[PDB]
Paper text:
Homologous recombination (HR) is an essential double-stranded DNA break repair pathway. In HR, Rad52 facilitates the formation of Rad51 nucleoprotein filaments on RPA-coated ssDNA. In S. cerevisiae, Rad52 is an important pro-HR mediator and Δrad52 strains are defective in various recombination processes including Rad51-dependent allelic recombination and Rad51-independent single-strand annealing. The primary DNA binding activity and the oligomerization regions are harbored in the N-terminal half.
Thus, to establish the stoichiometry, we performed single-particle cryo-EM analysis of full-length S. cerevisiae Rad52. 2D classification of Rad52 single particles in cryo-EM analysis confirmed that yeast Rad52 is predominantly a homodecameric ring. 3D reconstruction and subsequent refinement revealed strong density for the N-terminal half (residues 54–143). However, only partial density was observed for the C-terminal half, which is consistent with the disordered properties. The final cryo-EM map reconstruction reached an average resolution of 3.5 Å with local resolution ranging from 2.9–6 Å. Using the refined map, a de novo model was built for the N-terminal region encompassing amino acids 54–143. The first is an absence of resolvable density for the petal-like extensions observed around the periphery of the ring structure of human RAD52 (residues 160–208) suggesting they are dynamic in yeast Rad52. The second is the presence of extensive positively charged regions on the outer perimeter of yeast Rad52. Several 2D classes show the presence of extra bright density adjacent to one part of the decameric ring. The data reveal an interesting structural feature where only a small subset of the C-tails interact with the decameric ring of Rad52.
Residue numbers in the entry:
A (entry chain B), B (entry chain C), C (entry chain D), D (entry chain E), E (entry chain F), F (entry chain G), ...: 1 to 90
Write the structure that this text describes.
Amino acid sequence: INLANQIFGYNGWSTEVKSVVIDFLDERQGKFSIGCTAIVRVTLTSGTYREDIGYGTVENERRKPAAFERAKKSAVTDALKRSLRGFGNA
Amino acid sequence: INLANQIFGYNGWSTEVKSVVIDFLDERQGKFSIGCTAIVRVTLTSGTYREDIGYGTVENERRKPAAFERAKKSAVTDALKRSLRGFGNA
Amino acid sequence: INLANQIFGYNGWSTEVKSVVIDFLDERQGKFSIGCTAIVRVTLTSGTYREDIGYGTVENERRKPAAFERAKKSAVTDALKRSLRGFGNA
Amino acid sequence: INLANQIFGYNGWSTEVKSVVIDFLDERQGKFSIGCTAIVRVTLTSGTYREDIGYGTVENERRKPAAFERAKKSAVTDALKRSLRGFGNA
Amino acid sequence: INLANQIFGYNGWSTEVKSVVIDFLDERQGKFSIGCTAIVRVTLTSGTYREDIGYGTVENERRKPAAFERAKKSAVTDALKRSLRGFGNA
Amino acid sequence: INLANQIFGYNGWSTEVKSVVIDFLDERQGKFSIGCTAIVRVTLTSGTYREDIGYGTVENERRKPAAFERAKKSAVTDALKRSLRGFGNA
Amino acid sequence: INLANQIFGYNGWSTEVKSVVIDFLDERQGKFSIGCTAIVRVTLTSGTYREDIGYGTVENERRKPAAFERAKKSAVTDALKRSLRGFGNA
Amino acid sequence: INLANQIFGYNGWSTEVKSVVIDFLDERQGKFSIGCTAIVRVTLTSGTYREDIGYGTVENERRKPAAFERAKKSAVTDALKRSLRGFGNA
Amino acid sequence: INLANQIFGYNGWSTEVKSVVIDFLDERQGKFSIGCTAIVRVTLTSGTYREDIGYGTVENERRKPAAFERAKKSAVTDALKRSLRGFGNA
Amino acid sequence: INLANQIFGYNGWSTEVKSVVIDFLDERQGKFSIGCTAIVRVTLTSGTYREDIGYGTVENERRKPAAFERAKKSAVTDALKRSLRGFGNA
């Protein structure tokens, strides 16, 4: 993630999470196999964006952190997917 | 997709997903046959937009990654359809 | 479709799929006879727009590819309706 | 329609279908008597719009997609209604 | 209506149908007695406007053109009501 | 009503029917005793708006023009109430 | 109300009825004891507003003008409440 | 309230009633013990704005002026809370 | 609260209660243990806004002022949470 | 959070809680295990924004401050994730 804040400047690239929505909710023998779709929209200092969508899922999560960490992995998967789409080296 | 970044500038073309919708969900013998339609937008450096619409489907997906890669691959095929429709070589 | 990119410049005309809506869904003998209507508004550089409506239909599509095909054919019909509606030769 | 492109310029008038709605749906002995109401808004190069309301109908069309052409005829008769209301010869 | 196009410039007055609503629906011995209220706003070239509303009703219409000409007569009656409301001779 | 067009210029004052709302509906022995509240807003050439509310009610109307003249009379009495509020003599 | 037109100019003080809501409806021995709440904002020529809220109620109204004079009296008393709020003598 | 009109100018301080919400309704032995919340803002001639909420409650109000106190006393106490919040002496 | 007006200018800060919401309603033998969530946004004269979220609760309140607790507990808690977040001494 | 006020100026960064929503509510042996997601958006003086989401959970909270603590500490965890994502040292 810091590689992005390294290719662009400390005030070069921005983030605006459009929508983060739940896909399903499971209760099978206490397992919570749930996923989420997140759409972040980066904005370089040149006013060029790269909106995309990423997914984040968790399988068992008995303690009920299934809604805890799914959000962060989904959001960071989308940040990685934006770099995959463009700005691979610049 | 990288060819689009090659033909345009590194800050020449953009992407604005505005409509990701899942149409049907199946439960047949555990298999999930689901589809998704994605509509994106592009603010080109010259301010021209080749909006379009793409579709992606998955047949069995026993582990339920059906809702996982449907969105990503629908978005990528719709971005490909954007090149297919307009900007054939430029 | 490429003739539109030819009679105009590579950045001459635009496209904005305003509304794609499906009308019905059939299951008679496992056949899916479904049709959708789509509205688009191409935009010339001068700013003139041409809004239309286009309908795309499929008859049997037993393995349910209808949703995949309906959008593409509706968009193609919509664009042809634009071409006949205006800018026939310029 | 081409006569309108003749009196005006190739980039003189516009078109905007913003309200296309379906009043009823009949299945009398398989026949589909359905109608639709469409509202267009043409815009001259001088900026003087002209918005009216046009209606179309179909009587039998035992083919299930009787919705295929209703929109087209409603829109064209609504454009004809715009021609009738104003700009009769210019 | 052509008298309005005569007193005003061909590009002098404009028109936009704000709302077109259906009051009721009757099925008495197959006869349809239905009415609509239409609100249009006209706009002179000087920027002044004259909003008003009009009503159009049909009694029997056994063929069911009851929804066919109700809208046209409502819009016509309401433009006439605008003419009587203001711009009587200029 | 014409006195308003006389004290102001033909292009001095305007009118904007903001909202017409039907309070109730009656069916007693076929008689329709119904009313409506119309809120119009006028605008002088000096940009001084005068918004108000008026009401028109019918008592019997066996033929059912009860929804026909209620709206027009309500709009008229509200336009009159606007003059009662301000612009009495100017 | 005319005193407000006297203290200010003929085009100095404006009115904008923003929210008229009736809270309840009674049918007790046919008598209608109903109330209405009206919120309007006035505007001086100096671009200073003075928003408030007033209430108009009626008790018996056997003829059912209960919905007739409620709005008029609510708007009147709310304008009076604006006068009490500010512009007491100017 | 007049002290506010004294500390600032006659056209220096404004009022914008934003949200009046009725909390509940009581019918106990005909007594109406009801409360209301009013959110208003004031605007100073310098462009600064103070926004707050105020609550008004009534216990018995056998005659049912309970809704009458909503329009007056809740707004009054919220306006007082605005002065409490700021501009205590200037 | 007055200390914030003291470090700031008399017209330097602003308050905007964005959202006051009820969380729950409890009726325990007359007790009302309810809490409310208030999000307010402040704005300094330098155009530097600062949003946050505050909470205010009441335990027994047999007299039912449990709804009025707001602007006296919850909103002032948000005013204090904003002060804690930033502008600790300036 | 004060460290952010140290690296940036007293009027350098901002905060805007765009959406806080509670995920679930548990009533197990009186204990409440609830979670909340908050989306804040910091804004630097240079018009650069870190939009992000964070989560806050509470397990037992028998007294029911569960809806009280989560709102504050989830927003705090998410403002911390702001620094975790960007502006590591500046």
